[PDB]
Design a protein around this ligand. Structure first.
Ligand SMILES: N[C@H](CCC(=O)OP(=O)(O)O)C(=O)O
Ligand SMILES: N[C@H](CCC(=O)OP(=O)(O)O)C(=O)O
Lengths: 430, 430
């Protein structure tokens, strides 16, 4: 069934709630061990299921992401080991230690979010990742993929279920797929808490539109942007654009535009970068100001708010750093940004100005992946205006809960009628 | 108009964004000064407008909350002074200082939320509160009340507008009311960010239903709950129920139920508490188990998930502490809770168990107001599953923004093809 799953999930969440000390670390340890001890099973499952899917040939991005080999298995094992190691005290943590009057102290402890419902096109290299995520943040977890690789996902589900049942006393994790009517449970409320799409632009778009009245994660479209300044040496910009566009054209956080100080048009930079893009075979559009400054020009642009995911990168140019700010905040989804120059003043004003999901200074918008931030294995990428930004580390799955241990106190007793006063002494947090 | 207001708001937000050092503190200082220097104006405005509204006589809760006197003005002045004092460094704060490789350091700075849209029935003792809130968290602000007290609210708007224009160089705060079609702008997106209802149960309910796809605040219905244990001396429970129900029956966070160890039914506690409730004239319903244990009994109960706001408090009893947990998590909106006993073991298990918006140990659910937490003047009360819980302090209006200042780095350069490595040295945060 469906709802009984969610309730089993909540129950088990509270079950494993009181089991932090070396428990869940040991749990994901044994999970890694099981991952490295039942490989032939899961390897052959993935192989046969993907092979059976090949006869259909539904789409090359999927039919590529579906891959899985012992290398990826070693990678997942080591990543989950890292999560185990650094996941010591992400629950049951204090954040403030404050007193009000005699024997009147409070704090602000951490606590799970509840019953998450992750949705992704079958990239079965993800399932154990998020499973360890849940079992480290102790918040029980549902899962829901697509018909593709369903058998392999089922095998991984057996994996994680056994691994949890080792110690944990409850299967506080479940899979529900095979025609489960995304709109049906998506419409349901008061059981699921955080919808974490991961698959690709299709899922996140279809959700953000479809979804209504539910806390979600995941951005809309990774419309990056870049800037270069009159005080930037060129070869920087060159290799930067290389890392930016040349590397992984289908990446969510992959750059999709560019912007340059108009004055340095007279620096041959344009020719260098565009000849380089052609050396790497990159389709080129541009914008109105570029249509102005030159005669022949690359083709027109459909809409500045587009996305390509392949070797295509629009290009505009403006005179004002502030005009740059206007443009970034007007068109792009403000998922990312970057500045390249040597002056700090313009740089620091910029960094202090834009409200993207991050900024950089002589870096590569390919940097935003969490793993590159030493942030522990991320769970997604958020661009929403609340509760999480950019790389959503494991901390992006926790909330607060105030506790108070008084003796005999009350509200009216603190008024002038009683001998109760406020102190607000911020104790050293334990 | 409407949208131009929102855009003026965003512009001014970024305007005052780069003006932290003693600027906004001075701004709210001068705001308090103006509040204490143009009283006759605003006092007479409130007086005349409320008097004109009295002829209608729309509702006593409103026609009571509408009050305003020099005492309340002194109170607002001192509260905003407190906000000024403690609002030094809530923006431009670092949270982590981490390096990856040579000259590759990052951080995680704070940043406003954007363009908030607060909605409340006209309690004009609120407007300057939230205005100082915005101007301390630098996030520009809209405002939208009801037709009542519109003139007084307009006067306060003149107040705050002049106070901001003193220094701030932009009116990054605006009012839009007088028939502004809540559903119209509520439906609008991509300009407003956080909807903060404050008025009363009516507004929050009508919104939560009406609202769709927008980050909101404010709970649904402050269905509290209480527990008492077989290891609690009675007079505690007595004065606790006093402070709980007797004080402010219409309070959002006011208790609405009760629960007692069934064994101590044999302790005359029931008679004491109910005779006390009658001494304070409290309407009484109860629940099925109580219907069982006694014969005559108070009347039936419509639905356990109800709310009264007046001298009415349902009462149930269960044997199992865990059954208590089940009940709290099943019926109540889990806005609050409290335990009263002397054993820590049961107490500590409880506190570690329930997932309300807070818990207590020998306190009064009237405690949850933020001001009682030394938390600075709150802005609302959230019960949502994300981003804020219980007392939403001023910190509940801030987000994150990652910055990076590298030299010439890239993503592929960190692979084995380059001499780039990861360090993850958590520097001492500045
Ligand atoms: N393949 C990813 C890097 C590519 C990336 O941008 O992140 P992803 O969108 O695949 O989660 C990794 O292993 O860190
Ligand atoms: N009147 C409030 C206390 C009552 C209360 O529960 O808070 P409120 O719902 O009025 O914001 C105060 O001044 O702190």
């Amino acid at each position: 069934p469906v709802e009984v799953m969610a309730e089993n999930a909540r129950t088990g969440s509270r079950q494993m709630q009181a089991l932090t000390p070396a428990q869940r670390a040991s749990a994901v340890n044994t999970l890694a061990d099981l991952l490295v001890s039942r490989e032939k099973f899961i390897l052959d499952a993935n192989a046969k299921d993907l092979a059976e899917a090949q006869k259909s040939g539904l789409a090359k991005p999927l039919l590529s992401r579906l891959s899985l080999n012992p290398a990826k298995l070693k990678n997942l094992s080591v990543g989950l080991k890292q999560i185990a190691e650094d996941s010591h005290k992400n629950v049951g943590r204090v954040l403030r230690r404050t007193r009000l009057a005699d024997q009147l102290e409070l704090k602000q402890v951490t606590v799970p979010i509840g019953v998450l419902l992750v949705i992704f096109e079958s990239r079965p290299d993800s399932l154990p990742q998020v499973a360890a995520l849940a079992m480290a943040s102790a918040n029980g977890l549902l899962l829901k993929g697509g018909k593709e690789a369903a058998h392999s996902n089922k095998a991984l589900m057996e994996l994680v279920k056994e691994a949890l049942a080792t110690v944990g006393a409850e299967h506080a994790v479940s899979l529900v797929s095979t025609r489960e009517e995304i709109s049906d449970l998506l419409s349901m409320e008061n059981h699921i808490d955080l919808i974490i799409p991961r698959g690709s632009s299709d899922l996140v778009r279809s959700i953000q539109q479809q979804s209504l009245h539910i806390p979600v994660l995941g951005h809309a479209e990774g419309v990056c942007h870049v800037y270069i300044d009159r005080d930037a040496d060129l070869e920087k910009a060159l290799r930067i654009a290389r890392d930016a566009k040349c590397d992984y054209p289908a990446a969510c956080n992959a750059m999709e535009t560019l912007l340059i100080h108009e004055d340095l048009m007279s620096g041959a930079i344009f020719g260098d970068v565009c000849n380089m893009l052609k050396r790497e075979g990159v389709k080129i559009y541009a914008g109105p100001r570029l249509n102005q400054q030159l005669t022949f020009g690359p083709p027109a642009a459909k809409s500045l708010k587009h996305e390509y995911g392949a070797l295509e990168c629009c290009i505009e140019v403006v005179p004002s750093l502030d005009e740059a700010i206007n443009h970034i905040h007007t068109y792009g989804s403000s998922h990312t940004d970057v500045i390249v120059t040597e002056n700090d003043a313009a740089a620091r004003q910029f960094l202090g100005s834009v409200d993207s999901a991050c900024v950089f200074h002589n870096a590569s918008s390919r940097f935003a992946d969490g793993f590159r931030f030493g942030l522990g294995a991320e769970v997604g990428i958020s661009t929403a205006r609340i509760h999480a930004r950019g790389p959503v580390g494991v901390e992006g799955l926790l909330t607060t809960k105030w506790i108070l241990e008084g003796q005999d106190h009350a509200a009216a007793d603190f008024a002038e009628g009683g001998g109760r006063t406020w102190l607000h002494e911020t104790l050293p947090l334990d």
